[PDB]
Assembly symmetry: C5
Homo-oligomer: 320 residues x 5
Amino acid sequence: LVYTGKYREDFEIEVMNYSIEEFREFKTTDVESVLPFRDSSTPTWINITGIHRTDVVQRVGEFFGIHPLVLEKILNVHQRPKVEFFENYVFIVLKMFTYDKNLHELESEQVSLILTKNCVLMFQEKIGDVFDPVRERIRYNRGIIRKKRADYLLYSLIDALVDDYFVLLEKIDDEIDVLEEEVLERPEKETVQRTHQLKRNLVELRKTIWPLREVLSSLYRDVPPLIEKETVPYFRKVYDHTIQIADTVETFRDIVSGLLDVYLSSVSNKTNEVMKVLTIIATIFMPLTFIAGIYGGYPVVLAVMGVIAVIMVVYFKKKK
Amino acid sequence: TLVYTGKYREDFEIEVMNYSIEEFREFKTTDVESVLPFRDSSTPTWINITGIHRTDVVQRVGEFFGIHPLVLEKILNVHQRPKVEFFENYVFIVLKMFTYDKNLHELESEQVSLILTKNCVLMFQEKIGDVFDPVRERIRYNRGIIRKKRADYLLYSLIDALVDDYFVLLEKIDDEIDVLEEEVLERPEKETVQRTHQLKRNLVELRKTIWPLREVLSSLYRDVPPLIEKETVPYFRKVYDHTIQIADTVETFRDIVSGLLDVYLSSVSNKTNEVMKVLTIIATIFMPLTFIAGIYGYPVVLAVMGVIAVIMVVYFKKKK
Amino acid sequence: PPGTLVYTGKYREDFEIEVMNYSIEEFREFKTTDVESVLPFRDSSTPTWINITGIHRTDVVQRVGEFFGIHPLVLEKILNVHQRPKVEFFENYVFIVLKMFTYDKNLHELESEQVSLILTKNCVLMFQEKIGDVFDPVRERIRYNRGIIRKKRADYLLYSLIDALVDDYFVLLEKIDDEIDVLEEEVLERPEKETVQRTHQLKRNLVELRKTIWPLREVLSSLYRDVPPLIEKETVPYFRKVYDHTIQIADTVETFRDIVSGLLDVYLSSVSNKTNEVMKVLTIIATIFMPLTFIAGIYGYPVVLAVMGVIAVIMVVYFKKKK
Amino acid sequence: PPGTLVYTGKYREDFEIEVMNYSIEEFREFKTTDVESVLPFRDSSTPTWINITGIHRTDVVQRVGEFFGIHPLVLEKILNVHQRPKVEFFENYVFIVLKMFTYDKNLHELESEQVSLILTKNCVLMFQEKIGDVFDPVRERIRYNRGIIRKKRADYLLYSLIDALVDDYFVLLEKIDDEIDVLEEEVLERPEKETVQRTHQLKRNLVELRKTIWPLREVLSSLYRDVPPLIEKETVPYFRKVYDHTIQIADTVETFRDIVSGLLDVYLSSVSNKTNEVMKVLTIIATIFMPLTFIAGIYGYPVVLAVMGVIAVIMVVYFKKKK
Amino acid sequence: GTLVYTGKYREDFEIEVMNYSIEEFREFKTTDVESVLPFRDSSTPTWINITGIHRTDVVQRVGEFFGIHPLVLEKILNVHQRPKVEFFENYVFIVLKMFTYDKNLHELESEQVSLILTKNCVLMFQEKIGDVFDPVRERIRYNRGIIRKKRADYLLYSLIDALVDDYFVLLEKIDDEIDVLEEEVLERPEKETVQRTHQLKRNLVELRKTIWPLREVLSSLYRDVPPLIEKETVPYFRKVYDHTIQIADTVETFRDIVSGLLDVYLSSVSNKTNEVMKVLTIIATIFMPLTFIAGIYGYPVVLAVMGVIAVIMVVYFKKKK
Ligand SMILES: [Mg+2]
Ligand SMILES: [Mg+2]
Ligand SMILES: [Mg+2]
Ligand SMILES: [Mg+2]
């Protein structure tokens, strides 16, 4: 077991056992204190932050009886989102994105989940995630999350993550609006660089979102220990979302793909205006400077010089 | 919790049309409770709720017609692919309804949900304004066969009305394309590029919706639960075929439009090339001439100056 | 009302009906404008080709419809002319919709007419918008008892007509191939204002064609790979002949689409490098006669004229490195 | 009538027939122009390769057709030369259509000829448009009892011929790969009118080529994965060899299509660049010798020549920032 | 039937056997084909690595002796060919490519490697000395991993994994070029940059050409399995199958990104050329009327007029430039 990622900063474990009447929650750095929740009779959400600790992963792995190859996949962070179904657990891999604005580049963290009897095991690389609103609802017995079991937990978390993609997409939609100005209105050096960067990002994004969709398709259209004619519709809700997201990313890809073509046309057009001026200037003040300079007959030349400046300017009434 | 994600909050109205073979009533209210009883009408009723920002009214009709909460969420979320969902006791359909503002070249959508149910079609709009007047006419003036037939045929009639509207929309877009495909090779200018891009943008949003629309009606054509069988289905096929036609026509536009900047860029490159030729004839005569006129810090020079102005112009007989 | 029959097209000129009943021994032909005179052929025991030109006459369509027992929705489809080619199979008739094209050369634009067919027992009902079609060679063969058309029945008729129509697409494609050859010159050997307009017009046209030709192929695929009252052991191979044609046609339209898609890029390249030649002359001219006019102007003698001549020659034999 | 046999091609040139009957122990070879002299080989007990050059002779085709009992529609397909490569399987014969290409180098244009084959008991009927083909190496191997071609029967003959044809495509592809290397030089070195013309012609050719090669692959897929009178776990692997080849060929043609699709974009960028260098010179020249010629012309001494020299140097060390 | 080497590599010839088992290992290099042939019937895994297939004779000999269909021999000696897997009664036949990216002369060369899995042997045929399998040699040499405990199919796996792992390192090299170039294309606008861009696309084509079939190969070995000991070695083959998918994805990602570059470059350049035009046109548009009125004259009121309509220009190139 080797951690291929780059996050070694953090380590923490954060359990949230809850039931309809009363809820528990704590943090530890002692793996052994969580393990017993494997056999809790009520939902528990064991959130392991810091998988660089390959040892902790191996321990939880063994104790929850999780195939080694699945453990390898958890610690490998260069990897398509995916679902794997086993007899006694579902294994899910997702990415969690961050758009750094201002420096126009997009960073990802991998999150694995395992659904299992009465637990959701979750493995992060690093402190920071998108699941706080789920924490709130459990904390403040809101929605119905407390009434329902562990599969609905899994749903709630995935929904939280997918909902985050919408926020991410809004940030990207904004860049596109900005750039769609620049490209035809703020014509500029950073604009091309930025246009390309944006396409690059939309590729990496599309790279992840199509698999995400595939994941939730499987959870919607298969379903083993996630209670059937029961929570599936909620999983469909999210499946539908990913579809919407996928569509939206394609929409952006198209739009963005055009921009340079716009820019190129905007620039060819400006260059053409520039040529007209240079050519009017040159096409009046070169014969004029020429006849002024054969002398090397006064208001008769100034009259001739003024008159064939006027037969030009009212000939650049036909064009310009 | 039910939250309206849209942007339309000024209107609210409800408009019922109960009808049967013999008699025909209709009214408007803003009191939800006055329509609810039509749930159990033995004859077709078309309950049209305009103004879903009123999440309360939706929740009420939802509960009373026994409609899963998740379907209510979907009704109030307006950023969403057209789609069909089949349930034991109702069909749930989501469609978009478009508007092309010509001359300022931008395209707005409104979401319309439908629910088919025993003897009712529940319909939810965002705002006053729709495309269903011709259906109102036929019920009003007992025209066609709409009165003789039941509620599924109502559903058909409404969807058909909506789809038929897309054809009108497409005609409007076809017009812009004719206009632009002039401008792009006629007038060399900044707004023509802006417009071209705007058009592509629009055709994307349009295509975004039209493929799912097609998927919707495919489902209604090829599935059918309480849509009375070897009965109404062919009418739903009519519309399913329409969407296919529409889908085709949108692709046709996408292609054609995708070329335009390339046309424009070519149109502009060769205007700019004409401009260069003038500047270069002017320069290539009046620069050696102004040069020899200037080595002087008489009619043999004016003769030499006139003769190699003529060896140029009859050398720009080979080119220009 | 979407049950009332309404003609969405734009052709209201003509109306005519033209029957060709034929059999192995004898052949019976006429024109009428009285629908009722054709209806009895519904039950003819020999092939009959009833050709109704002028569907703006929604009434005649409705009559023939009722009498041959044809679902109203199929009637609606007949009168709607903005529509993919398609085949619909019913218990007692096949319904087919095709387009029929015309390329106006020299004004580089191409127009379509919709023709519907219905195969049925011993009849082919056919509905056109307007006088003018592509079926004359079928008329000849029936007229002059040629080929085998007379020996065979009504499905073979249907085949014969569709084959006639598809064969017309090849002619159309030759016309278009010609435009392409012309443009492919202009675009790199007459670089000019009408050439871009024309290039675009051609792409447009190839789109509309491609729009229709893929469906056409879908149609004949269905007739080839399904077959109800198309006699089995019999006519199918002939339908496959045409199915294969449509494939060839489809392929040919793609080939044109590709080729044509490049042309502006060629033109744009052709133009970029003309504009580059123009710059070189302007820049040689400027780059000799500006220092020279400058030195000539410092002054407000044959050592200067010698210096002016010599660094005109170090330029021209430096535009031996480039130009 | 589309039962009448008509030759749609453009080769009326030639007519010849060339039989090669062979067996383990001896071989025959002769030419005739009398169809009737070959027909008996239908019932030869040893492989015979009957090669009919000149299908404009629709009569000869009809005769061999009837005598070998070959469905008329198959005969129509033989005489139609505008057509996807394809296989058709019948009870007593396999029918195959292929194209045969020629790259004229140096005038950079590509001609095709259609070859049909029919495998049948102990015969391979072959139909060409015109004298000239790619099958000589098969002739040699039969002639000089080489390989195993003499030991094996008629399906292996079919294989040998198709393999000869496919192997020709590789040679053709090498010729095209060469053009690509040449052009990908010109395109970024030789700023010129013929390079664009050539680039386009190359794309055109790769389209026509791709047009044919995907179907070719489909053909040999069918022969590999179906197999009626092709003796079974016997000849099939040889047909797989060729099937695999066509896959390689298909890939290679896509590879070329891509690469070539970029070239104008390269050229356009190469040219935009050159034109930009030209502008820089014209603009440094103009941006020095225009203020200088201007102040030299105010007049209408070494303090001016010093000022004229110094702001020629604040320019040139300002075109240190750009240039 | 006749065996002809279509390739370009005639430099080398060598044979290199590695017989190994759980306890003992043997290893030698030979120029005499006949010294390896007996290992056909070794009871323990043997990795017979024949470098230099231009020696069509040696191939024919090993072919006959291991009983290998002639058409498979033809395929071995033909080096212009998709990766592929062929299954036979008593051997699996695999063809792969093996790449090298020469940096700084931005060109990458391929070599074909065919493999044959067979009872207790992996026959391997290279064109030329040089390969990517050294780490497999180490693990056998220094009884590392599990490779000694396991049989010949796991050997096959180990070699293919070594090759596929090499594609990742190749991709990293290519990812670097992309970063460099996406620099040049919008910073250092220039003649070599276009050449390089094109060469990169070319390379990504050739790579994509190979990587999709590679994926297909390992899909086949993952999904059906004859003498690959089944619920045994298969997951390891799945590991590699998954890799090829990851690689395929990464090549697509590069193809997209790179496909834009000339368009970037072309836009970068059009712009620069437009800036150049602006200076030429400001220069020309002040110093041509000025030089003109200075030249009507074949004093400080003129120099004042000449200075003032130089300033109404420059503060008119304050709307624009
Ligand atoms: Mg003077
Ligand atoms: Mg309607
Ligand atoms: Mg382009
Ligand atoms: Mg990187």
